[PDB]
Structures are given as structure tokens and as C-alpha cells.
């Protein structure tokens, strides 16, 4: 029997001083997501570099053990001989412009769609379904390229592009506060171990000042990158 | 050790020092005498210490404890 807000509470279950580790900040980050629906878990890292320059900038990708990989049902859609290299690569389902009438019926047993540049003319019409669902392939995501083989096989690992802004802090949602416990560990760990190997040779001294793992709207927490 | 002489109150007397720059010689050094004012707690007494007993004359129960009867107001 007691009335509370939405800050004082969470602010009590966390500490700024103590340096919570990966395993510790695990059963804590989930307790800080007492919000509607599924909240996303991010991770802010303070890099000691110079944003004004480019040689100091960091740009790469991290392979998240969970969220992506084989669990995903990527569907390949191309023509010509690009259809053969799709099945031999290891895709869930492959087909030409014939399956276009299938998705219109209600078949959406997929999460990742990729196609060439010689079919986008018709795929563009699906901007009403695949468009909003972000299922439509885009050049940026690299989902649109003649080398569909290296594409479908690439998503089989799953990556998350990341860079440095005018400040010098990097952050990429390694998942949500709904996933398991052991999962949120390998993802966060892989995120660091990956970005670390992308440090500029021009960097001098400590490359990391402090690491944090916050969510959509809630207090932060200093995470130990070493562990 | 013992602070030089310029009065009393607590310390003793002179304790000359020396040099070592380019030669050793007995230098007649002095002390950071100075004094302190204290009214509340007793009667006005200008104890001229040596900036090293200020924490043992007005801090502890050296006199801070305003006592009525007893030996002369002065430390003696």
C-alpha cells in the first residue's frame, strides 16, 4: 500500500557508484523495463578520440549471436540464374516474381527479404505491404545487389553497423529486455569485443572512458567491458 | 622537537639550525611566534604561542572548559 512515480523507484534499484558487471547488470536491466510493450536495450560507450578528424572515426559491423543468424527466415526473390545460387546458398525459400502473388494473400512467414535490381520495378508496388514492414530491400541495407549469394549467406550471421558521431559515443541495441538472460550476455559481450578491434591506430592512451547500458527511457548503468 | 624562544605558554626555548647550501654553518634561526585572542570561556589572556600549540591551548580541554574556581586564570 503505497503510491509511487516512475523514476524514484527504478532509481532505487540501481547505483551509479558500484561498477555492475555483465552478469550483474543482466538481472537488473530487465527490472528497469517496467514499461508497456517490449522495450529495447542499448549501450552507450565513451570513446577517447577526435571527431573532427576522420582517421579517428570508427566504422564496422558486429555479429550478434542472438536476434539474427539461422533463427531468421530470410526469403530470396530473384530471376535468371540468381535463383539457383540462392537455394544452393542455404535460403529458407526462393522464387521469382511468381511468389509476389503469394504475399498478397497473407503469406508473411518471413522477416528478411532480399532481391536484385532487375525486379525492384515490380517489388516497388509492394511498398504498401513490404514497404511499411521494412521488408522491402534497400541498397543501404545491402539487401539489393547482384551478389545475392554473398547476401543471403551474410545475413546467416547477422550484423549491426555502427559508427562515431560528432561527439564520440557509440550505441547499438543488442536486443530487448524480453530476451533470455544468457542471451543478453553474449550479445553485449560480442558488441564490445567486436567494436574494440575497430579502434583507430591514432588513438593514444585509454580508448574507453566508461561503458553504460541504458534502455528507451530509464537510468543508466556503468558496465565493465573487461568482463 | 622544541620550538625556539620568544616567550613560553607551552614550548621551551631556542633550538638553532644550520645550513647546507654550499657550506654548513650554525644559523641562529627563530620561531613563528605569533599570538591568539580568546575571551569567551574565561578572561582575556593574550597567549603568544608559536603557531604549533594553537591546537593544544584553545582546542582540547586546556582552558576551553570554562571553569569557575581553581588556580589563577593564567596557565602559569
Amino acid at each position: 500500500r503505497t503510491r509511487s512515480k516512475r523514476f524514484l523507484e527504478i532509481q532505487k534499484l540501481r547505483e551509479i557508484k558500484q561498477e555492475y558487471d555483465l552478469k550483474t547488470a543482466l538481472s537488473l536491466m530487465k527490472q528497469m523495463s517496467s514499461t508497456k510493450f517490449v522495450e529495447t536495450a542499448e549501450a552507450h560507450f565513451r570513446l577517447n578520440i577526435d571527431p573532427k578528424y576522420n582517421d579517428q572515426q570508427l566504422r564496422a559491423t558486429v555479429s550478434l549471436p542472438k536476434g539474427t543468424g539461422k533463427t531468421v527466415k530470410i526469403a530470396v526473390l530473384a530471376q535468371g540464374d540468381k535463383i539457383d545460387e540462392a537455394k544452393a546458398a542455404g535460403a529458407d525459400i526462393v522464387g521469382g516474381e511468381e511468389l509476389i502473388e503469394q504475399i498478397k494473400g497473407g503469406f508473411m512467414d518471413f522477416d528478411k527479404l532480399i532481391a536484385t535490381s532487375d525486379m525492384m520495378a515490380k517489388v516497388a508496388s509492394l511498398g504498401r505491404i513490404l514497404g511499411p514492414r521494412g521488408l522491402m530491400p534497400t541498397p543501404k541495407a545491402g539487401t539489393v545487389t547482384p551478389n545475392v549469394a554473398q547476401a543471403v549467406e551474410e545475413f546467416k550471421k547477422g550484423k549491426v553497423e555502427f559508427r562515431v558521431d560528432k561527439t564520440g559515443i557509440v550505441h547499438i541495441p543488442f536486443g530487448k529486455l524480453n530476451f533470455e538472460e544468457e542471451d543478453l550476455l553474449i550479445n553485449l559481450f560480442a558488441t564490445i569485443k567486436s567494436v574494440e578491434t575497430n579502434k583507430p591506430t591514432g588513438a593514444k592512451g585509454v580508448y574507453w572512458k566508461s561503458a553504460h547500458i541504458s534502455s528507451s527511457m530509464g537510468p543508466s548503468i556503468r558496465l565493465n567491458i573487461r568482463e | 622537537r622544541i620550538c625556539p624562544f620568544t616567550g613560553k605558554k607551552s614550548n621551551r626555548a631556542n633550538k638553532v639550525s644550520h645550513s647546507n647550501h654550499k657550506t654548513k654553518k650554525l644559523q641562529f634561526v627563530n620561531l613563528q611566534y605569533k599570538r591568539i585572542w580568546w575571551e569567551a570561556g574565561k578572561r582575556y589572556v593574550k597567549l603568544r604561542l608559536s603557531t604549533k600549540a594553537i591546537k593544544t591551548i584553545e582546542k582540547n580541554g586546556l582552558d576551553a572548559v570554562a571553569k569557575k574556581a581553581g588556580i589563577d586564570l593564567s596557565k602559569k
Binding site: - | 591568539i36 585572542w37 575571551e39 569567551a40
Partner: protein, 147 residues
């Protein structure tokens, strides 16, 4: 490290527990002023001057929050304010017939400075939300019978 307590043109009130100026108490603030000396000996003593000022949140609040509990299942308040004029009334109600009614049955008395703005003159159910302190609130009902 001292205890200001008596805030006087100084950055700090009720004694400062954080780094403060120096050489400003060795012969002024301390003597014939505000007994500071924030030492482990006066620290525990200082608390006994504030902790007893916080207890009112776990004690005084208790002996004031039960107001909504003690008064909630009480019988219906039958107070006739002279209902006539065809439909209106004669008696006047501003705060008296809003708190004095508590004594109307089984003794008990309450202050009149605990009621909100009066209610329109009628004979229906009244909603006298008893408001003691800005921390706890209660609810009181009032009715009128044509005499």
C-alpha cells in the same frame, strides 16, 4: 569542514556536510556565533537534531493518515438544514454543517478548517471531502431530511 546551521549570507543551510570555506571560523563564526566544528563527535549529535524532524513522516503521518480510515464506514449523516421554499432550503451551510455534524452523534470533534468550498443549497447527497493535510485526504457524506 564545519556546521553552518544558521544560514547567513553563506552557501549552505542547516549545516554543510560538504567542503566549505576555511579560516572563516577559526575566529568569528565559531566564537559568539554558530557552533560548527563538524567532527565525528558533533556529527551524531547533529543528526539527533534533524532525524527527529524527519520522524514526522513515519509517525505524525500515521497519526493523521488514519483519518480516512476511522471516518469512512460511519453511519449516514442525518442533518436537517430546513428544507422548504417549495424546493430550496432555509438553513445556511458553509462549514458548520460540514464538520460540526461529527459531534451530532457519539461525541467526537473536528476542525472546520479541513473542508473545501461549500456545496449548492439542495437536499441531495453531499460530497464533503475532508482534507486534513496535503499528504492525506478523507471522504464525508451529508444528507438532508425535510422536517
Amino acid at each position: 569542514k564545519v556546521i553552518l546551521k544558521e544560514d547567513v549570507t553563506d552557501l549552505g543551510k542547516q549545516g554543510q556536510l560538504l567542503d566549505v570555506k576555511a579560516g572563516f571560523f577559526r575566529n568569528f563564526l565559531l566564537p559568539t556565533g554558530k557552533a560548527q566544528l563538524m567532527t565525528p563527535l558533533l556529527l551524531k549529535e547533529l543528526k539527533m537534531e534533524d532525524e527527529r524532524i524527519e520522524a514526522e513522516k513515519q509517525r505524525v503521518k500515521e497519526e493523521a493518515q488514519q483519518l480516512a480510515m476511522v471516518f469512512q464506514t460511519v453511519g449516514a449523516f442525518k442533518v436537517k438544514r430546513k428544507g422548504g421554499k417549495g424546493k430550496l432550503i432555509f438553513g445556511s451551510v458553509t462549514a458548520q454543517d460540514l464538520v460540526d455534524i461529527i459531534k451530532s452523534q457519539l461525541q467526537k470533534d473536528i476542525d472546520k478548517r479541513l473542508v473545501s468550498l461549500p456545496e449548492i443549497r439542495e437536499t441531495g447527497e453531499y460530497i464533503a471531502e475532508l482534507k486534513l493535510h496535503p499528504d492525506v485526504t478523507a471522504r464525508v457524506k451529508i444528507n438532508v431530511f425535510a422536517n
